Design a protein around this ligand. Sequence first.
Ligand code: B3H
Ligand code: K
Ligand code: K
Ligand code: K
Ligand code: K
Ligand code: K
Ligand code: K
Lengths: 101, 212, 219, 219
Amino acid sequence: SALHWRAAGAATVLLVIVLLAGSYLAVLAERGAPGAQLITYPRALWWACETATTVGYXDLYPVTLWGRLVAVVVMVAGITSFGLVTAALATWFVGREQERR
Amino acid sequence: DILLTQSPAILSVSPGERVSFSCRASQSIGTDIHWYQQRTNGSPRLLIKYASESISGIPSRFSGSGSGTDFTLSINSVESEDIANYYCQQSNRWPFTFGSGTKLEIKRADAAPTVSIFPPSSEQLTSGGASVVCFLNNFYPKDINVKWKIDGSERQNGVLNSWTDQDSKDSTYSMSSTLTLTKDEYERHNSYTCEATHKTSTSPIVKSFNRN
Amino acid sequence: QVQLQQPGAELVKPGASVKLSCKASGYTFTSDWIHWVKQRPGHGLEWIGEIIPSYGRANYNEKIQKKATLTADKSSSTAFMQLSSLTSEDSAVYYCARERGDGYFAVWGAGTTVTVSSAKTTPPSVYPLAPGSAAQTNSMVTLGCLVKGYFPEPVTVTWNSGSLSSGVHTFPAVLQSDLYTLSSSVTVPSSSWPSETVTCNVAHPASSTKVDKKIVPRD
Amino acid sequence: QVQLQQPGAELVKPGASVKLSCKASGYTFTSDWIHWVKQRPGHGLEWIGEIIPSYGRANYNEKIQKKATLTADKSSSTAFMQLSSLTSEDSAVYYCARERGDGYFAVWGAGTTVTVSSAKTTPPSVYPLAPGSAAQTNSMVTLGCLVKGYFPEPVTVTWNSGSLSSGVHTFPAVLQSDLYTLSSSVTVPSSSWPSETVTCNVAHPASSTKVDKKIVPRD
Ligand SMILES: CCCCCCCCC(=O)OC[C@H](CO)OC(=O)CCC
Ligand SMILES: [K+]
Ligand SMILES: [K+]
Ligand SMILES: [K+]
Ligand SMILES: [K+]
Ligand SMILES: [K+]
Ligand SMILES: [K+]
């Protein structure tokens, strides 16, 4: 197993961890702010997924400073992970294309 | 913060009939509404979650509906055990809040009261006191009057009354009237009477005893 | 088994402070929150605050004056609410409840009746209530037991340690001269008494005193 | 051709259950949903539930008590609604409708009249109604046929197997002693009768009986 592939799998396991920790900490950060909606865990994990993939419908989002900081970590972890996979697919294609030559 | 309005505050229905409690939120809360039941002296009990989801252990008779700002808790064929207070609570936005509550009341057939008179006990006298207790049990409607007569003469001093809430066993009401007097005051009198005036009888139901 | 255990009562003098407890059992998760709800006699449910034990953070109802401070003990699985500088306005039943972080209160404690009074604790006097010698009887007979001279509320009255629930009425207490009084009533088929015992159990949490009183016929 | 076929009627005793059917024809897609709508006499349309045959999943109106269970049969292209433990409150016309998954009901069934009664089925007696011998006539003449002694509703009355629609009035049924009665009226130019036949066709789905009755002059 090549490095690019390992970094990818590793990025995916880390993403799943950031999603679960993100869901937990967003609820922790948001309860206490009047009007906040990101306050029960099942919808926070869903919020965490749509943030990490950058879709951002939104239907829910953080209103406090710490929930937002948590949002930024989720965003960056998702963008980095999906980017790592893209780059791993590139390394794979470039390697196999040099063999077809 | 989200204001939950429950109206009416009191709902009266006939046995076996279908009833509906209403809860209106000041703004839209999807289906994040939960219903609880609290019987007299009891702690709240979860009945429906997320507006319409069943809870294990709760009679199928109970159901919820609504989304948005308007919610309904329904009971198919209400029965005595349903006599209680009902609350809605929302979890859509911080902080969680409760509605003010709706009381369920059942209109059953009229029932005459069962009166019982009890002389003070020996253990009580020994401590220098006397209490003549009278129970007016399982009557309906709840409107009722009780009169005390000592040796044929109406007594009013030292009389404390107490009424129970509609009974969740048979939808009736009951009341207890207690005449408290010192051993002395109790010793210089013969018979004690308890008279109950109720809608079910033009004549009062009375109970008396004489300390021989 | 009971998931949340709370003391039955607490007497507190105006200006003083008390710390209520809520001991939890059953499944416990990192996503659990313990809530406290206040209910005054004849009134509704009022949210006070919440705490997430696994992390120790608490939030409070901003619409009301802050009388509470919440803390939790991970090892003993107990949540505590410190009420301070109380007044009569603070007298009510305080329930704790558990929420699995999904918004609804799956289970509630039995509640702690708190009384803010300068008065003094006093156990109740339990007296029997058997029919008088002249009282005629039908297919059913009614007995009861009188509970008076106690403070503060409440008292719990059971018949035959609970096995006798049907046919029971316990009237609300009445306050007179810093002392409460109430009576409970029980109706059993006349042919079953006194051949079969009928005892009333009266518990008064505020004084840690529980007493029984068998009901037998007069003379 | 008729896209949704449903039985005309069903008689059910209180407490019993019945299963209504809706046979569909025409184009059928994976995105079709079949809906059921209840309508009580003199009242509006009430949504009951829906089912997507291609997958077998059904949803129901939560605002009302659940009396229905929906199922579908892919091979026979038929949707079924099982109503159970019925009472008079459940007596009404039940329509099925088809939605191509885009929100509106493109086509509806004719509907099944359901009656919840302890009564018994009874075919209708069809009698003629020709003018009396002294009745003078204008450029038009009026004939009719009397339908009585039937149960439950409904009955469908046509004139000359449908070819005669204009000039027709079928009055609403009246209930008396567990039996319905109604009359239908037809007006044709006086010169056309009786040279040209005029027959009234009366169908009563609840008893699977259809009968005709030609209308001729008296004596
Ligand atoms: C790939 C990530 C997908 C995340 C989906 C989250 C859905 C949340 C939800 O609605 O869940 C609703 C239910 C309750 O109805 O909550 C639960 O007990 C389920 C545990 C997740
Ligand atoms: K994007
Ligand atoms: K986006
Ligand atoms: K977006
Ligand atoms: K958006
Ligand atoms: K948006
Ligand atoms: K991208």
